[PDB]
Amino acid sequence: PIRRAAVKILVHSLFNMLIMCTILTNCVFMAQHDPPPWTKYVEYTFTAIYTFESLVKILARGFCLHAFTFLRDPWNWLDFSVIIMAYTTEFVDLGNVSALRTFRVLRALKTISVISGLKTIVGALIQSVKKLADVMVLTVFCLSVFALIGLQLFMGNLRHKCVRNFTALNGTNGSVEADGLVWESLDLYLSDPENYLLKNGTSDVLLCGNSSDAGTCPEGYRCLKAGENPDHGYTSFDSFAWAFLALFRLMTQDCWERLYQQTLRSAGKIYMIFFMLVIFLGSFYLVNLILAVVAMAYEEQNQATIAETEECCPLWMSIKQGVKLVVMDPFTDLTITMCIVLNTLFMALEHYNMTSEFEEMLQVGNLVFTGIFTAEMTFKIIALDPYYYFQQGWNIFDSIIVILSLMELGLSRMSNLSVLRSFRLLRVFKLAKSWPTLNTLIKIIGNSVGALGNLTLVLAIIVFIFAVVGMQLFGKNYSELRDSDSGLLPRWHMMDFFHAFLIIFRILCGEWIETMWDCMEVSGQSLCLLVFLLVMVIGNLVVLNLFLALLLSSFSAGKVWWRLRKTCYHIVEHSWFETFIIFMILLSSGALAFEDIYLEERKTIKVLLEYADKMFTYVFVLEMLLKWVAYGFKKYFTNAWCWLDFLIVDVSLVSLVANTLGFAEMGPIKSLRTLRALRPLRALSRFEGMRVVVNALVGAIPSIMNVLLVCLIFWLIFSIMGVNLFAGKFGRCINQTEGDLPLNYTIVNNKSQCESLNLTGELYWTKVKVNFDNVGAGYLALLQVATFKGWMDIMYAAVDSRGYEEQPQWEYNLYMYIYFVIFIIFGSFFTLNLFIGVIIDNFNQQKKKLGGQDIFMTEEQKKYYNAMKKLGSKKPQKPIPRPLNKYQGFIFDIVTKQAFDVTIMFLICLNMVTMMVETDDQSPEKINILAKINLLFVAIFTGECIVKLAALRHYYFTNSWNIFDFVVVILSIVGTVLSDIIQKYFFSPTLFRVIRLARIGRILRLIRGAKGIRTLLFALMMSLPALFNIGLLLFLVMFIYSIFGMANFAYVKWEAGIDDMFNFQTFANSMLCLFQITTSAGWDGLLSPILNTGPPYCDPTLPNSNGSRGDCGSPAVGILFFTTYIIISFLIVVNMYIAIILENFSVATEE
């Protein structure tokens, strides 16, 4: 029959090509918002094609009872699904959802089985997850524990608001209040929102706690607890769901700076210990436990798979001879490499307001420089025939660019304004043959595009599917978020396809929240959370699998002088002298923390400092001189540890020699004294842990300068592109009084119109703080987009680039989001891959040199590791239980049963769920039932210990898990007892909660027997000393940068991220600000006030106490402080990741 012909038609590749074309046509047609009704054919033709494909399959391998053949393969289930859904829907619709268009999106996941590579990858991305199992359960366990702790500590503590004062009236029957307007009912008032105060600058409402360490309210405002939680109600810690989402955002580090700042501004600055604990414990150890598990697997499958894979005639010549003769000369190569360098430099000299001299030469520069290349190609064309000239993989390269460039310059009236110039740019890549690191950077782009080019295809398919699903589900709704005043919807919407692609990308780049929040207000919470969080788990898994993979691939492929010297050697050998020095170093360092804006007026201390200042230097000088004698000039000048102390004491001596003698406080001499900030640095030598860490970091310096260099050139391409695109297009008019937002483009469109309507001086043409005007000014902005912090203001201004020297417009240049999309993959994803690989390699080799020994670890810490590891590498053997007394001879058998263990372990889960039910604003009846139950529970538990103690005299204690337990119950028995004792105690709300929190300890009791957590948590215990050595280095570094910040960044305007409680006006406020920045969080808000010197935006001549005048921060030093810190912090936190990853690969791999 035709079945045998159906099999023939089944095996052809034309069938697969037709199926792929139909699927791609469907994908293109599905991305259209208001589909047109011409679709009588298409929805129907497709349905015909997809029915025909299933017909071909069932005719060839269908028949009857096909458990063995058709439909057995899991993928064909999708196909049948598609056909049934299709017909049912196309038939009629009566009282249904009718938004079942989203079901068609599933038709496009059929590409997976056809393109052959896709099916296997989506097969193995799925098997990866199966290995991240424990990690996902510990994630849930730790998230629940921290959610309970946050619930108890900040129960309803996010609602506090500064509200206008009220009085009670006493002329009306119920609670009545007044403030120029009588308002019936307290709650009618504590609710209305014209009675709350707007935080300066932001549009929020102030959050104000009553504790001393917390926000204080303005004069006419009392600070209470009434109203609706910030950010529309999704941030409060009132309920366990809201204390789980708001703490999972802390795990993923999404806008955690906003919650940190609001939480503390209501509960107090001491409560920053909780945040630190969440950020270290979870964001770091957890995220990394997952990356290591995802990695443990990729290697395993590739290792098994690779292993299993193993298992003219007169004269053309005399001068043709000549043409080659010039071409191959070694010096012919030098002229060339160098001419490349000059071009990049010549190019990177465009700027915003070039004087015409800089401009004409810039043109007279390209001609010469492109020309040199024309001679290189023609000579190289005359050298050999075109058969041999278009090969080897680097002649073609050159050939195209040379060709493209010549092309455009020719019209002279040529239209492309910029790329046209930057076509030349790619030449920079040519330095590759010479540069191993640029060669490695190119090989990675190539690998991802071509070889493991199936993973990126899978990622693109997933992103497309998620974008179309989100658009279809949520597009209709976002029309309300539209301001009907301006018909302006959000900048992030999902109404159209592109706008959607971007929300899906943002979610990939880390920024998922501000969007659930803006979609849960138009769409209803249940779905928004379901979809916008679905993109996350899958996506971050795919983006990570592609990344880990690219990396792995590169890896796979008088005679008394001689005794006077010894008598001063012995004082060095005497412990007491240098210990004095060590203490003197700490004290010396500390005394820096007291110089705040208020020391000027703390007289009794100001002076104390100075006596000490002097003595401090002397104790040291006596020490430098003592050393020079004891070890001589050789050892002191050759160790490079004494060199740092030498420079520090040099500048310290210059300070007092110029000041006291010279009576000179003029010019930069005081600026030299802002460098006493480094007195902390004396310490790095002294403490061994900080020392092994700094040695490990120094050993990696040569590679880091190369990796930092390639980025610098690569971002040079992006920076010159950005300068060429957005030069002079970031300036916007502002009416000042009315506000900080550009005026409309219809009212004022050109700068010539901006400065022609200033009859009343309110209009200021102010550029964006971070913009594209210089090549160097470009690189900051790129640091903001590449770190993802502050990038939104740059992206919102580039898209509005209406043109040169003219007002911005709302979305004139929408597609420039593409530039930003391109930089981020190459600039953030690929450059980072190189960074991580090289760091790992240097590290890998160092470990080998000192074989069997991690870096980041002292000698004494070694021996701990050695014993600690031994304890849990071997299980205990020989329990030896004894009946003992007949009195307990029938109790000890019951206490040891497995049934007893599981019922206890499930009573702990019952306690867990009865804990999860708390909430703010609970009725007396609820509060009441719940507390009685808490008493019941303590009781069962006290008892359990008791029977466990029946005759288990010695072994209750030696279990080391049982011993942990007594403590828990005692804390608990006390806890209940301590309950009514608080009455004679001050500040009653916060003493209580903390003792309540001991209840969580039971929660921690579940893991005696849950092995998965036990190995995984044990690991941290083995890694704890390494993290510590690095931590001290982070701290010493924070102090040094904190002192530097208070030196210059005090008295800066308070706007953006410098606000009253987080400012650089003292030590505590300075160190709080650094804590956010150490995670690169919110670092543009900190810096924007610094980079502000201006008649608008700041004010010259404010009168200031200590710093004496000026209210405007300095950009030149501020840009250096933050930019240097972001990098110093990056390299130090990255160091930690390796410490865990290798060590988690030391506990798991070992077993």
Ligand SMILES: COCC(CCO[C@H]1CC[C@@]2(C)C(=CC[C@H]3[C@@H]4C[C@@H]5O[C@]6(CC[C@@H](C)CO6)[C@@H](C)[C@@H]5[C@@]4(C)CC[C@@H]32)C1)COC
């Ligand atoms: C060759 O023999 C050496 C061997 C171990 C070598 O295997 C390596 C495989 C890659 C892997 C898992 C390793 C260490 C760091 C891991 C990285 C930490 C980074 O952290 C992240 C997340 C946070 C971001 C800031 C960027 O960096 C990831 C992208 C990066 C990461 C997860 C990419 C994958 C890396 C181990 C030792 O055997 C005993």
Ligand SMILES: NC1=N[C@H](O)[C@H]2[C@H]3O[C@]4(O)O[C@@H]([C@@H](O)[C@@]2(N1)[C@@H]4O)[C@]3(O)CO
């Ligand atoms: N996860 C985020 N980290 C950034 O610190 C935040 C700042 O920068 C940014 O561009 O806009 C605001 C906020 O949305 C940000 N989101 C964006 O990155 C911001 O508060 C001020 O700009």
Ligand SMILES: *[C@@H]1O[C@H](CO)[C@@H](O)[C@H](O)[C@H]1NC(C)=O
């Ligand atoms: C109640 O009314 C009396 C009238 O004499 C007034 O003096 C008193 O202050 C009022 N009390 C309150 C609660 O305001």
Ligand SMILES: *[C@@H]1O[C@H](CO)[C@@H](O)[C@H](O)[C@H]1NC(C)=O
């Ligand atoms: C309380 O309000 C009621 C309703 O208007 C009013 O009738 C009554 O007089 C009030 N109480 C007094 C005694 O003022």
Ligand SMILES: *[C@@H]1O[C@H](CO)[C@@H](O)[C@H](O)[C@H]1NC(C)=O
């Ligand atoms: C408002 O009442 C508060 C209550 O603490 C009080 O401190 C403040 O002085 C009052 N404001 C004015 C201006 O009276």
Ligand SMILES: *[C@@H]1O[C@H](CO)[C@@H](O)[C@H](O)[C@H]1NC(C)=O
């Ligand atoms: C602050 O204190 C006042 C007086 O104790 C009290 O009325 C108010 O409830 C408190 N508000 C807050 C912020 O809890």
Ligand SMILES: *[C@@H]1O[C@H](CO)[C@@H](O)[C@H](O)[C@H]1NC(C)=O
């Ligand atoms: C600026 O705003 C003020 C106050 O609204 C208004 O009166 C003034 O005309 C505005 N100036 C311009 C030209 O925008």
Ligand SMILES: *[C@@H]1O[C@H](CO)[C@@H](O)[C@H](O)[C@H]1NC(C)=O
């Ligand atoms: C600018 O004003 C014009 C009318 O003056 C208005 O049509 C336009 O929408 C305004 N632009 C915006 C979006 O502010």
Ligand SMILES: *[C@@H]1O[C@H](CO)[C@@H](O)[C@H](O)[C@H]1NC(C)=O
């Ligand atoms: C800017 O636009 C105005 C019209 O709004 C026009 O008259 C003016 O001459 C233009 N100036 C420039 C920069 O060409």
Ligand SMILES: *[C@@H]1O[C@H](CO)[C@@H](O)[C@H](O)[C@H]1NC(C)=O
């Ligand atoms: C507007 O005119 C005032 C005159 O006081 C001036 O200070 C302000 O800078 C002007 N703005 C511009 C950009 O001309």
Ligand SMILES: *[C@@H]1O[C@H](CO)[C@@H](O)[C@H](O)[C@H]1NC(C)=O
């Ligand atoms: C807010 O602005 C007012 C203006 O009077 C200022 O005095 C106040 O200190 C500012 N508060 C903060 C914290 O920005």
